[PDB]
Design an enzyme around this catalytic site. Structure first.
Site, short mmCIF file in Angstrom:
data_model
loop_
_atom_site.label_atom_id
_atom_site.label_comp_id
_atom_site.label_asym_id
_atom_site.label_seq_id
_atom_site.Cartn_x
_atom_site.Cartn_y
_atom_site.Cartn_z
CD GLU A 23 7.39 -8.08 1.62
OE1 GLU A 23 6.63 -7.33 1.36
OE2 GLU A 23 8.79 -8.24 1.33
CB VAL B 225 -1.08 0.02 1.42
CG1 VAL B 225 -1.79 1.36 1.10
CG2 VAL B 225 -1.87 -1.12 1.17
#
Ligand SMILES: [Zn+2]
Ligand SMILES: [Zn+2]
Ligand SMILES: [Zn+2]
Ligand SMILES: [Zn+2]
EC number: 3.5.4.5
Lengths: 123, 123, 123, 123
Positions: free
Chosen positions: B56, B44
Site C-alpha cells: 500500500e 518488498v
C-alpha cells in the site's frame, strides 16, 4: 554502459513528484534494471515522519511492481537536481536488489553500493 | 462508481511482483486515483525486516511518481487474492493521500479509511 | 577508554530481550553515551515486517528516554553474541546521535560510523 | 485498575526527552505492562524522516529490553501534555504487544486498541 546523464535526468524528473510538505526537501531516484528498463521514485512524507517513503525505496517498489530483476545503477538527486547519497536505510534496501555491485550516481564518479555500505548486514 | 472487481484484480496481479523471500507472504495493492488511473504496489521485504516496504506504501509511491492526486479507493490482497486489511502503518500512509473517505476493499463492503483508522493522528 | 568487552556483553544481555518470532534472529545492542551511562536495545519484530524495530534504534530511543546526549560507542550482536554490523537504517539513525566518530564494535577493531556510512546523507 | 493520571504523567515526562529538531513536535508515551512496571518512550527524529522513531515504538523497545510481557495500557501525549492518538504504525506495533484489549489513553475515556485499529492485519 550506463548512461548516467539519462539516469540522473530521470531522477531529476522523478523528484518533481515528491510529496514533501513537511521538509520541502524533494528527492528523486531513477534506476537502471538488468533488463535495461528504468524505474523511478520520489520522496513521500507523512505527518508521522517515520512513515515517510524514500525515493530509492519507491524505486525498489517500481522495480518489483514492473517485473523485478536486479538494479544495475541508481541516481538519487534533490529537487535541485544535485546528486544525493542515499540515506542508510536506502543503502540497505538497494543492496537487497542490486547487491554490492549496484552503482550509485557520483561523487565525481559513481560508487559501488558495497563501498557506500561496507561490511553490510546481513545477506 | 468504483469497479471493485477491477481494483481487486489489479491488486491480485500486483501481488505477483512481491519480493517476499522471508515471509513468503505476498501482498498486492491497487488504487484508483482521483483522475481515474490506477496505481499498483506489491510487498518488498528486506533482510533487515523493518525495512520492508508494504504494497500500500508502494501504491502511494506510484501515486506520486505518476502525477500525484488523491486516492479514492484501494484494494489490498494476499498472494491468494484474499482481501487484506492494510496494516496500521499503511492505514496512516493511505490517510495522508486519500483521507478518511478513501475506500478500502471489503469486509463484505468496502470500508472508509476513517473507520479503519478512527480518531487518526494528527492531520 | 571504551570497555568493548563490557559493551559487547551488554549487547549480548540485551539480545536476550529480542522479540523475534518471525525471523528467530535476535539482535542486541548497547551503547556508551557521552556521560558514561550505557543504554541497550533489542530487536522487536512485527507481523507487518516493515514495522520491526532494530536493536540499535531501540538504543537511540533509550538514549533520549534517559536524558539524551551523544553516543560514543556501540556494540551490536546477534543472539549468539557474534558482532553484527548495523543495517543501513541503523547506521543512519546512529549517525544522527553519534556522528561519524561513533565507534561501532568490530571487525577485529571497532569502526568509525563514518567509515560504515561514508558520504552520509544529509546532515 | 489503571492509574491513567500516572500513565499520562509519565508520558508527559517522557515527551521531555523527544529528539524532534525537524518537526519540533515532541511525543511521549508510557505504558503499563502486565507485571505492573511502566515503560516509557519519546519521539526520535532523523534527517531521513522515514527513520524517525515513534514514542510508542520506543515504549515497545523498553518493554522488551526490560523483560517483555504484555502491555495493558498506554498513554500517548504531545509536548504540551495533550492526549494523542497513536499513528497507524504505532497502533499496529502496539497490537503485537498488547493485543486488541490494550487500553489507549482517552478520548474522554481510554479506548481499546481493537477499536483504534479495527479488523487489524494480520495476527
Ligand atoms: Zn532513504
Ligand atoms: Zn502495511
Ligand atoms: Zn537496523
Ligand atoms: Zn507512531
Amino acid at each position: 554502459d550506463v548512461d548516467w546523464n539519462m539516469l540522473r535526468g530521470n531522477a531529476t524528473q522523478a523528484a518533481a513528484g515528491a510529496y514533501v510538505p513537511y521538509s520541502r526537501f524533494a528527492v528523486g531516484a531513477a534506476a537502471l534494471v538488468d533488463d535495461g528498463r528504468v524505474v523511478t521514485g520520489c520522496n513521500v512524507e507523512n505527518v508521522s515522519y517515520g512513515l515517510t517513503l524514500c525515493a530509492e525505496c519507491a524505486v525498489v517498489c517500481a522495480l518489483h511492481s514492473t517485473g523485478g530483476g536486479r538494479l544495475l545503477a541508481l541516481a538519487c538527486v534533490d529537487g535541485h537536481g544535485s546528486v544525493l547519497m542515499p540515506c542508510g536505510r536506502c543503502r540497505q534496501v538497494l543492496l537487497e536488489h542490486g547487491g554490492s555491485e549496484l552503482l550509485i550516481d557520483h561523487p565525481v564518479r559513481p560508487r559501488r553500493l558495497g563501498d557506500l555500505l561496507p561490511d553490510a548486514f546481513g545477506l
